[PDB]
Amino acid sequence: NQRDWVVTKSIWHLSDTAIKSFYTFYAMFTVWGVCFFASMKASMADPFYDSEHYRGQGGDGTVHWYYDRQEDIEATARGDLL
Amino acid sequence: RRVCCVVSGGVYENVLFFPVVQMLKDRYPGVLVDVVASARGKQVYEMCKNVRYANVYDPDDEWPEPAEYTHQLGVMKNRYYDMVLSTKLAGTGHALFLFMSSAREKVGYVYPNVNGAGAGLFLTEMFKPATTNLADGGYNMYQDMLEWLGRPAKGVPQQPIPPLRVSISKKLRAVVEDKYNRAGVEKGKYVVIHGIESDSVANMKSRGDDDCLLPLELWAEIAKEISSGGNGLRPLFVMPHERHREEIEEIVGEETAYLFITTPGQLTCLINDSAGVVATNTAAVQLANARDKPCVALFSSKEKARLFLPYVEERKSCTVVASATGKLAGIDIEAVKKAVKDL
């Protein structure tokens, strides 16, 4: 309503009301069933995960492949055998 | 058969470990031998032909937090070594670190009396005193325990494998050596000078007082008559293995044309592309004496029998000058330049 508070230092009066989405909390979840549209933004090109400046695909592969050092020591042994 | 070495220390006390590795790969043929060392030491294993792949755990601190401890054990154990031969002079605490690595034959060094003499029951072939002074004697126990100890294998299998025979990969031999050489003067006809100042050059872990540096005045006096004469006529390579961007501005070996480079323990190639080398007792001595590379070693006095066993390297090429006063920073620098002027 429009209750009229006569406060002891000023000239107030107010008006309030209660509102809440009745059941459209279902309809908004249905609309957010747009994750079924997560397929057009996945078939798009990958930025660099397919770029030529990338080989090795794990979570530590490219970073910690890093043991061509052993193969290089072996190549050194082979060159010494030559 | 798999083998793990736990050699400790930096560079100069780790470059001398190559004979042991070669003796391993010679006695038991076709053995994968890995190594764990310190960060400054692992840098040396980038020029070898035996080790499979190095690692870095032990500067051998006191606390190291008990998750980097377990994980280290958790990577030694889960590859099933057979004989984890060690150094660093295990007492009774570090012996457990070898023991929990469930191998077959645990051989290492131990403290004579100090630091809890101990040596434990759970070991094998514990031996001689600790501070590991002499060079090319070094692990002298190891080159005897791995010699014919067991079986019809021939009489002691080539007692102390040929001295340091480090190899250089032609990729590093060409590209980085050339790039750093030609940055400044370069003809492959120069002379390397190593001992300058004190940050982490090699420090040798054993020389103690001398060979750490010269006051850079003796170096200037030497260098002014190095290129004097058509012998080299290239060499002004003060070769400062320091933060020398903190030192190059004070090369009183006048900065006119005294070149300079920054290097890790990779300088073996730079030695191999020089026309000689003149340095104090440091890694450069052993590296140059490994190849032909006629060197000139200038350490304090009479320490030769400790730090330089192959007095005659190839033709008595590598020559040594002592100091009658005993302190390195006093020498017949005149006779030094006399000896150097021939090469």
H or E segment to which residue B277 belongs: strand B277-279
Structural tokens at position B136? 């090319």
Calpha distance B252→A39 (Å, rounded): 70
Q: By what method was this entry solved?
A: cryo-EM
Residue A42 one-letter amino acid = A
Tell me the nearest-neighbour CA distance from A75 into chain B, angstroms: 8
Structural tokens at position B143? 């080159």
Closest Cα in chain A to B45: A73
A73 touches chain B (CB under 8 A): yes
Residue B320 one-letter amino acid = V
Cβ-Cβ contacts under 8 Å for B139 (sequence gap 6 or more): B16, B17, B19, B20, B87
Q: Do B50 and A77 touch (CB under 8 A)?
A: yes
Q: What is the DSSP string of B192-218?
A: EE----SSSS---SS-TTSSS---SHH
Are the C-beta atoms of residues B291 and B314 closer than 8 Å to each other?
no
- Label the pairing between strands B295-297 and B277-279: parallel
Using left for φ > 0, alpha for ψ between -120 and 50, and beta otherwise, residue B14 falls in alpha
Tell me the nearest-neighbour CA distance from B97 into chain A, angstroms: 26
Closest Cα in chain A to B22: A77
Closest Cα in chain A to B53: A70
Q: Which SS3 state, helix, strand or coil, does residue B34 take? A: strand
Calpha distance B24→B30 (Å, rounded): 10
Q: Do A69 and B50 touch (CB under 8 A)?
A: no
Calpha distance B77→A15 (Å, rounded): 76
Are the C-beta atoms of residues B6 and B12 closer than 8 Å to each other?
no
